[PDB]
Design a protein around this ligand. Sequence first.
Ligand SMILES: *[C@@H](O)[C@H](CCO)NC(=O)[C@H](CC(C)C)NC(=S)Nc1ccccc1
Ligand SMILES: [Ca+2]
Ligand SMILES: [Ca+2]
Length: 326
Amino acid sequence: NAIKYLGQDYENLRARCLQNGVLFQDDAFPPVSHSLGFKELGPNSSKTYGIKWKRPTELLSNPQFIVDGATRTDICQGALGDCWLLAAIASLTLNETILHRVVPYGQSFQEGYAGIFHFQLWQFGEWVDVVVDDLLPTKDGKLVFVHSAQGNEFWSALLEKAYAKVNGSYEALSGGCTSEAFEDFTGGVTEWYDLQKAPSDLYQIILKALERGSLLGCSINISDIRDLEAITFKNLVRGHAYSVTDAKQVTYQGQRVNLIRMRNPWGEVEWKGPWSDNSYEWNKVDPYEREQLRVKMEDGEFWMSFRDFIREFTKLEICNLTPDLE
Ligand SMILES: *[C@@H](O)[C@H](CCO)NC(=O)[C@H](CC(C)C)NC(=S)Nc1ccccc1
Ligand SMILES: [Ca+2]
Ligand SMILES: [Ca+2]
């Protein structure tokens, strides 16, 4: 039932390319400099020096669309300020159902491969099917923008290309709002929380939202752009979207403590305060919980106590997946 974005028809385009023995070349979002940007990603910018658009097949012998699931570890920001989109994609992967509504099953660099992929976005009160060819910006044989921790996996690179396409170029994605991407991925409605004015029931709100599969994001508001992406003393990033990926209570020295888990879409650079991966607090928790919850890995994902979280972060976004009609 999805609208064909720009009347481009995924199955017909793929059937024709296979028939004519060619690879799709997307005339609606060509491998050219207007698709990158005009300013920072302008043609005469040093950011775009040496960029060549390459298909994943031109990059290695065995490219894969999905390796071991479409999971949040597949989301590692490249040279673009699209943290807000990426945080929203990492959150999306927590619920398999809505994930694969955005990223339809069956997509491959083998069976049915004609250099064309497709994704479904919610735009102006309807689901739309957006195609892209798989020419991607690379420099020295490496992806410039989003990439997966798994070097041969391409679904997230292609999803971000499709989202850049609906916005006109990659550069349109620099600076934005996690909610917008949450809504584009879901049809949901977003409610936001000022963490310095949190309702006394906010942790319960978080628990229930994550149970129901809603998308959660958080950030440290900046009011001065010299603070954009500043790293804090405890290794948070300012003006930067994180994904909220879990909320669990632990038994710490016999006491119950509210923890919250989040993920920097960079795929690295984590909190170093209490509850961090190598933090001391973990030694004092139930060993079933420690083994269940704590992973010692530089992967961008970490825990904080809810107490520290509502001190350090300033904004929480919750996207509800089943909104009321109006
Ligand atoms: C994350 O990589 C980027 C870096 C910008 O170059 N940060 C943003 O896009 C932030 C993300 C928020 C704080 C969650 N948003 C910005 S800079 N501005 C903005 C624009 C539109 C709506 C809200 C916020
Ligand atoms: Ca994967
Ligand atoms: Ca970690």
